[PDB]
C-alpha cells in the first residue's frame, strides 16, 4: 500500500455484464490479446461454463491454454499454475469464484499481464479490486493496478442459487456506510489518496440501486429470470460496490467480518457477506444511529433474507471471551476500523456485537416478522429450503 | 472503428491522479507503467510552464526520458515523425498539455501498443479521460469521432499548474462539464447506445450527477479561487467534476445535441475560432434545452447560471450577432449528419429546426438579462487561447 | 429558596461519565481534594463498588474516612455521621441511591465542604440538584450552591436491574412536559430567577436524547451492554434532565407525584420516575392536549415498559374520595403546580389522573398492545420478569 | 496542565446571574461564597463607571472589602504584586471588566486556592464562564492556552452597565459567539477531545446550538436595541447568548481553525492591533468554512449574517488590504503550530492551504458583496478600544 496526499480514482479498464456475454468473449477479450490466452477454472466451472469463453476465442483464431484451478490459492500452487502458461501467453483469464479471481491476479501480476476477471456468481465485490485477502485474516494486499476487464455472463450469474446473491447484497450494503465512515473521518482512501467525489457518488449508486431493486433481483433470481431489476443487481454487487469501496473505504464492517474468523466453529459455514451485513449492523451500533435508523436497515437485511441475530448467524452462544477475541482481531493495527475517527477498544466491539443480537430482536418481536434465516451445511450450500413466496 | 454491443459496459482511465505539486510526485504513479523509459511529449509553451518538473522526477529515480516537441500541429504527417523519434524500447507515452498534444499522445500510444499518460495542463473541456479524438480538417471544421478500444491509462493533474492557469481556461471547462448531465441524460432516457458500446450502466448516470451537483455547489467558488490564484478545496472539486466526472459521466452516457451543435457551429467560421470548446458547448447546451422543450423557467435557471459563470449566452458575446439565416441552416445541416451524436436523442429534427432553436436560445437569453437586470457580459477575446480581455474579479 | 428578577443558571461545576470511571476517582476528587476525603456509602454499596473509590484515592497518598450509611437520611443520624469525620477533611463523597446523596449534600453543606455525588443507578435526576425533598412530602429544600461533581461509572449503572434505568427515564420524560410549562408561564425559575435559553435547550436536548435512544439504552441495559446508546441515556437521565429541570422548573407531573403518596397502601412499591410518568400524563391532560398527542406519550412510555395505567400503578380500585385527596396534596400552597398559568381545583386534578386511565386504556384497545408493566414486590425490586424481546 | 480523559465531561461555573441593575444586588449572590471579606479588582476606567456599586451591595450589607486597582497590565510582575495586597482572611476575589482583569482575577483567585466571581463589563467575547487564559507575549503575540482545573464560580453581569457600552463591543461578541457553533460541531464531528478534557457531551452540543439561535433570532434586534440604548428582552437574549451559551458551547465542544486562524492573524501586527477579538474571530470563522469546503451558498449565508451585524468579512475592512502572501504564510505557520485547536478537525492542513482560504474568503465576501448591491462597510477605528467611528443606527 501506497499513501499519497493526491485525490486518487482507480479502476479496471472495462466492465461488461450481460445475458450470455460469455458467448461474445472475443470481442472484448481481443482488446488485450488476439492470439493466446490462458483460461483458469476449477474443474466444476470447467464443466458448467468456462468452455463458452473458450469456444468464442478459438472460434476466433486464438490458442487457448486450459488450465484447471486446484481450489487452493496458495504460492506453491499458483507457482505451478505460472509454469504451465505458455511463454507467448498474452492475457490470464480468472473465471469462478474468489479463490480463482485472486489466483489469475496473482499468476497475471507475476507475469506483468493484463487480466480478465469472470465472476460466476455476484457474491461480493472483489472481481474489480486490486487487493487480495491474505489469510484467520492477516492483511490486505494492493495490487498496482486493477484487473483490466471484469467480464460478467448474467446467464451464468441468474443460474446460480439466490443465496449467492444475497451474499453479494449484504457486502453491498455495506459499501456505502464505510465509505461514507471514511470520506465523513477524512482518512486515506483505499485508493491510496484523498476521496474523490466520484467515488462517493458511485458508493451513493449502490445504495440507491439496492434499496430499488435488491429484493425484486431477490425474487427474480429465485425464479430464474434475467429481468433488468436482476441485472441492476449484479451491477450493484460488483461494480457499483467495487468501485464505491476502493475509491472509498472499509473501516468497522468488514474489520469485523475479519474478527468474526476468529471464532471459527459454525462461522466456516457463513458466505462473505452474510458476515458483512452483522458487521454493518455492528458498525451502526458503533456509529451510534438513533434505533429507528437502525431498524430501517435491519429490516431491510431481514427482507433480503440476510441474517441479522447471532441465532441466525448460528452462534447464538457465543462467550464473552470469544467475543472479546474478536474485538482484539478486529482493532488490529493494520485493520480497517482505524480509517474511523471515533476510536474502540476491545469491549466495546463485543457490547456492540451484543447489541445488535438484542435490537434486531426486539424488531423482529414488535413488527412480528417471522421470516429468519437459517444458516445451510456449508458456506457453498443453497438455502436449507425456497424463499420464493 | 467503434462497436456497438447489448451488453452493459463500463469503461475508464486506469487511474486519475489530482494534486498540488503532483508532478514532483510523477515517478510514484508512473513506475506502475514504465520503470526504465518513457517518452514525453509536449509543445515549447508547456515545456517551459511545467513539463520540465516530470522530466526531473523520472530522471532523479533512474528513467531514461525521451524528450519530443509537439509542433502544434496534430497531422499524421507530424504525429508519424513524432512516432520515428521514439526509441524501440520505449515503455509509455506522455502527454502534457493541451486537446492537441493529449490527442497525439494516445495516437502515438496506441500505434505502439503502449499505455498512455494524459496531463492536462489547464482544465478547459473533458477530453483528458476519454478514448475518443476529435478529427476536424486542417479549417477547423468537425470530420468524426475517433475511438480507441481502450481509455488512457492514467490522467496525471497538477491542480498548481491548473491554478496558475488563466480562469477562461476552467470557465471553458464548466461549460463542457455543464452538458455532461444534460447530453447524458438524454442518450440514457432514449434508450441508445452509450459511447461506452453497449447499454448505459447506472454507474456512469451517478458520475453524470455527481458532475452536476459539484458544479451546482462549487463552480462560481472556484472560479473565483482561480482568479485569486488560490487552490481552495473548492477549486480542486470542480478540476475534478471538469476532468473525471464530466470525462466518466460522458463517455459511459453518451453525447447528443449539444455537442452536435458545437459541431455544426464551427462551421459559421469567422471569429468563431476564437471560441474555445466549451464557450460553444455551452450556448450548445441552452440550444438542446430548446430542443427539449423545457419550460422557460427551467431554461431561465440553466442560462442565469452560466452567465454567472462568465459563459456566453447570447449570438452577441459568441461574436457573431449578425449571423444569417441561411448560415445558421448550414449549422443545421452540419448538426445533423449521420455521424452525428444528435442521432441519439429519441426526439428527431430537421435544419430548420437546429437553426430556430439557435435563434431561440438568443431571444430567450436577451429576455432573461432584460428582466433580471443582468449587466455582466461575456467578450471574445483576440484568440482562442487568450485570457479574458478583462478581470472578472469582484 | 430565594427568588430573583435576573436570569440565572445554575450547574454543578463539573460531571463525568465514564465507563470504570471509580479507577480513576484521584484525578477528579484532587480538583477539591488531595489529603483527606469522607466516603459514605450503606453496607450494600460498600459491598459492591465503593472500595473501587477509595482504592483510586489511597493509592494517590490520601487519607480515606469510609463511613457506612443506616439507610436512614434523619437529622439525629446525620450529625452522628458528621461527628464521624476528620476535622481535616476536605471533601464530602456519597456513593449509592437518593437517600445516600442527600445525606452527603446535607453533611458537606453543614461542613461548608464540596461535595461530590457518585450515583449508583440511573433512576432518577436528583443527583446534580441543589434541593433535597424533605418528607409525605412537606416541601424542597434548596441549597445555595450544587453539588461541586457528580461522578458516574457506567460499568456500575449497567449492572443494575434495567427497572432502575426506565424509572430514570421516566423522570427524564418529565423535564421536557414541566419545564416548558414553567417558562411558557413566564413563572420564576427553579434556579431563583427568569429562565435562561440555555436551560431550555438542555431540556430539549433530554426529550430529543430519549426520543432516539430510549430504547436502545433499554435493551443494552437489559444485555449488559455499555454501548453509546446507553451512555447517553445515562447522560440524559441525570446530566440532562438535572440541568433541565432546575434552571427550567416542576410543575403538575412532580406535585401529582407527591400527591400519590398520600395513598400510601401498594403506591410504595411504585419507583420516583414510574410515578412521576403516570404525572406527566396527567399534566398532558391538565394541559389539553389532543388526544393523538396524548397517545403519543402514553405510547412512548407503554415502549419503555412504564406504567400508563392505575392498574399497571397497583392501584385500580383507588376511590374517589381518595383520588380527591391526592388533589388536595397536589394543590398544597408550596407545591410545583401553582408555576402553571392555567390554576385547577382538586376534582380537576382527580378527573385527569381518572381520564389517563381510560384513555391509556383506549390506546392498548386500539393497537392491540399487549405488554404491561407488572407492579414488583418492592421498590427496590427488579422486573417480575424479563423484558428482553 | 490540561489533562485528557476518556469520560463523558460537562464543565460549568456554579452559578450564571445576568440582569439590569444586577450590580445593585450584588450581595445576594455573592453571600454563597463569601459574607466576611471580598477582593474587588477593575482598571480605574470601571471603578468610575459601575465597581463601586458592588463595594457599596457588599459594604451595606457588612462585607469588608479591599478595592484594588488593576494597573491594565495583566503581567505575572503586576498579578503577584495585586496578590500581595490581598488580605489573608480574603474569600473571594472579584474580577470587573474585561477580559484582562477577568484573567487576572481567575489567577490570584487560583493561586490563593478561593473561588472567583467574574463580572464582564462589556459582552464582547465569550471568556467570562471559561476554565482558560489566553497567554500572548507583550507584542500581542498568542503563546498557549491555560486551563485551570475548575470554571470561575460565578459570572455576573449587569445588562444596564452591557447596554451602555458602544454597540462595537456586542457586535465583537456576537462575532465570537458566532464560531461556536461551527467549531464545536467540527471538534464534535472529528471525535476529538473536548475542551473539557473527555468525550463531548451531548448537553454541551446543544447549549452550543442554543447560541446559533438566539443569534439567528435576536442578534440584529439586540444591535439595534444596544444602539438605541434599551435594555430589551431580545438584547439580554443576545448577552447571554455571547456570555452563558457561547461559553458553556465552546468549553465543552471546542476550539478548531477559526480561533487557531485568529492567533495566526494577530502575528500580522501593523493596524490587526485595531481589530477586537470577535472581529478577527468572524473571519476566521468564515476561513474555517472555506477550510471545511461548505458550497459558496452557504458561505454567503453565513457571511451575509455578517455583514448585516456590520462584521468584517474582507481584508478592506480588516485594514489589511495589502497584505502579502509571504505574511498569509506565516500566519499559516503560525495557524498551524502544535498546541493549536485547528489540530482537533479530522481534515489537516498545511500553511499554503491556510494561507489560499484567507484569500479565498476575501475574494467569496467581494462577489457577495457585488451581487448584493451590498454597499455597508466595517471601517476599523483607531484602537480596539474605540467606538465606532460612525453611527450605524439607521
Ligand atoms: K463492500
Ligand atoms: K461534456
Ligand atoms: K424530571
Ligand atoms: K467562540
Ligand atoms: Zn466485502
Ligand atoms: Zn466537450
Ligand atoms: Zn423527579
Ligand atoms: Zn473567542
Same mark, same amino acid.
Given at each position: 500500500?501506497?499513501?499519497?496526499?493526491?485525490?486518487?480514482?482507480?479502476?479496471?479498464?472495462?466492465?461488461?455484464?450481460?445475458?450470455?456475454?460469455?458467448?461474445?468473449?472475443?470481442?472484448?477479450?481481443?482488446?488485450?490479446?488476439?492470439?493466446?490466452?490462458?483460461?483458469?477454472?476449477?474443474?466444476?466451472?470447467?464443466? @458448467?461454463?468456462?468452455?463458452?469463453?473458450?469456444?468464442?476465442?478459438?472460434?476466433?483464431?486464438?490458442?487457448?491454454?486450459?488450465?484447471?484451478?486446484?481450489?487452493?490459492?496458495?504460492?506453491?500452487?499458483?507457482?505451478?499454475?505460472?509454469?504451465?502458461?505458455?511463454?507467448?501467453?498474452?492475457?490470464? @483469464?480468472?473465471?469462478?469464484?474468489?479463490?480463482?479471481?485472486?489466483?489469475?491476479?496473482?499468476?497475471?501480476?507475476?507475469?506483468?499481464?493484463?487480466? @480478465?476477471?469472470?465472476?460466476?456468481?455476484?457474491?461480493?465485490?472483489?472481481?474489480?479490486?486490486?487487493?487480495?485477502?491474505?489469510?484467520?485474516?492477516?492483511?490486505?494486499?494492493?495490487?498496482?493496478?486493477?484487473?483490466?476487464?471484469?467480464?460478467?455472463?448474467?446467464?451464468?450469474?441468474?443460474?446460480?442459487?439466490?443465496?449467492?446473491?444475497?451474499?453479494?447484497?449484504?457486502?453491498?450494503?455495506?459499501?456505502?456506510?464505510?465509505?461514507?465512515?471514511?470520506?465523513?473521518?477524512?482518512?486515506?482512501?483505499?485508493?491510496?489518496?484523498?476521496?474523490?467525489?466520484?467515488?462517493?457518488?458511485?458508493?451513493?449508486?449502490?445504495?440507491?440501486?439496492?434499496?430499488?431493486?435488491?429484493?425484486?433481483?431477490? &425474487?427474480?433470481?429465485?425464479?430464474?429470470?434475467?429481468?433488468?431489476?436482476?441485472?441492476?443487481?449484479?451491477?450493484?454487487?460488483?461494480?457499483?460496490?467495487?468501485?464505491?469501496?476502493?475509491?472509498?473505504?472499509?473501516?468497522?464492517?468488514?474489520?469485523?467480518?475479519?474478527?468474526?474468523?476468529?471464532?471459527?466453529?459454525?462461522?466456516?459455514?457463513?458466505?462473505?457477506?452474510?458476515?458483512?451485513?452483522?458487521?454493518?449492523?455492528?458498525?451502526?451500533?458503533?456509529?451510534?444511529?438513533?434505533?429507528?435508523?437502525?431498524?430501517?436497515?435491519?429490516?431491510?437485511?431481514?427482507?433480503?433474507?440476510?441474517?441479522?441475530?447471532?441465532?441466525?448467524?448460528?452462534?447464538?452462544?457465543?462467550?464473552?471471551?470469544?467475543?472479546?477475541?474478536?474485538?482484539?482481531?478486529?482493532?488490529?493495527?493494520?485493520?480497517?476500523?482505524?480509517?474511523?475517527?471515533?476510536?474502540?477498544?476491545?469491549?466495546? @466491539?463485543?457490547?456492540?456485537?451484543?447489541?445488535?443480537?438484542?435490537?434486531?430482536?426486539?424488531?423482529?418481536?414488535?413488527?412480528?416478522?417471522?421470516?429468519?434465516?437459517? &444458516?445451510?451445511?456449508?458456506?457453498?450450500?443453497?438455502?436449507?429450503?425456497?424463499?420464493?413466496?
Amino acid at each position: 500500500f501506497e499513501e499519497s496526499k493526491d485525490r486518487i480514482f482507480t479502476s479496471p479498464q472495462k466492465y461488461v455484464q450481460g445475458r450470455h456475454a460469455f458467448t461474445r468473449s472475443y470481442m472484448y477479450v481481443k482488446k488485450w490479446a488476439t492470439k493466446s490466452a490462458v483460461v483458469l477454472a476449477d474443474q466444476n466451472v470447467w464443466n @458448467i461454463c468456462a468452455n463458452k469463453i473458450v469456444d468464442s476465442l478459438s472460434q476466433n483464431g486464438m490458442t487457448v491454454t486450459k488450465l484447471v484451478f486446484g481450489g487452493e490459492a496458495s504460492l506453491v500452487e499458483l507457482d505451478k499454475l505460472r509454469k504451465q502458461c505458455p511463454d507467448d501467453t498474452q492475457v490470464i @483469464i480468472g473465471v469462478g469464484g474468489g479463490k480463482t479471481m485472486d489466483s489469475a491476479k496473482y499468476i497475471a501480476h507475476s507475469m506483468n499481464l493484463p487480466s @480478465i476477471i469472470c465472476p460466476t456468481t455476484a457474491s461480493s465485490d472483489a472481481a474489480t479490486s486490486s487487493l487480495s485477502v491474505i489469510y484467520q485474516f492477516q492483511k490486505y494486499s494492493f495490487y498496482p493496478l486493477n484487473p483490466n476487464l471484469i467480464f460478467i455472463d448474467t446467464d451464468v450469474i441468474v443460474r446460480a442459487p439466490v443465496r449467492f446473491l444475497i451474499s453479494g447484497i449484504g457486502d453491498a450494503l455495506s459499501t456505502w456506510v464505510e465509505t461514507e465512515s471514511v470520506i465523513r473521518s477524512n482518512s486515506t482512501s483505499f485508493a491510496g489518496g484523498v476521496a474523490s467525489i466520484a467515488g462517493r457518488y458511485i458508493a451513493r449508486a449502490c445504495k440507491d440501486t439496492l434499496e430499488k431493486y435488491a429484493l425484486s433481483a431477490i &425474487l427474480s433470481n429465485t425464479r430464474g429470470v434475467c429481468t433488468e431489476a436482476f441485472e441492476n443487481v449484479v451491477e450493484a454487487n460488483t461494480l457499483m460496490s467495487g468501485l464505491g469501496f476502493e475509491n472509498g473505504g472499509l473501516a468497522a464492517a468488514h474489520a469485523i467480518h475479519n474478527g468474526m474468523t476468529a471464532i471459527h466453529g459454525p462461522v466456516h459455514r457463513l458466505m462473505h457477506g452474510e458476515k458483512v451485513a452483522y458487521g454493518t449492523l455492528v458498525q451502526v451500533v458503533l456509529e451510534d444511529w438513533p434505533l429507528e435508523d437502525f431498524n430501517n436497515l435491519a429490516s431491510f437485511m431481514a427482507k433480503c433474507h440476510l441474517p441479522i441475530t447471532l441465532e441466525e448467524l448460528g452462534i447464538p452462544n457465543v462467550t464473552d471471551e470469544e467475543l472479546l477475541m474478536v474485538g482484539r482481531a478486529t482493532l488490529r493495527p493494520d485493520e480497517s476500523i482505524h480509517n474511523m475517527s471515533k476510536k474502540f477498544n476491545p469491549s466495546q @466491539i463485543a457490547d456492540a456485537i451484543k447489541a445488535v443480537d438484542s435490537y434486531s430482536q426486539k424488531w423482529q418481536e414488535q413488527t412480528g416478522w417471522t421470516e429468519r434465516f437459517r &444458516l445451510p451445511p456449508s458456506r457453498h450450500s443453497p438455502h436449507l429450503t425456497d424463499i420464493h413466496p
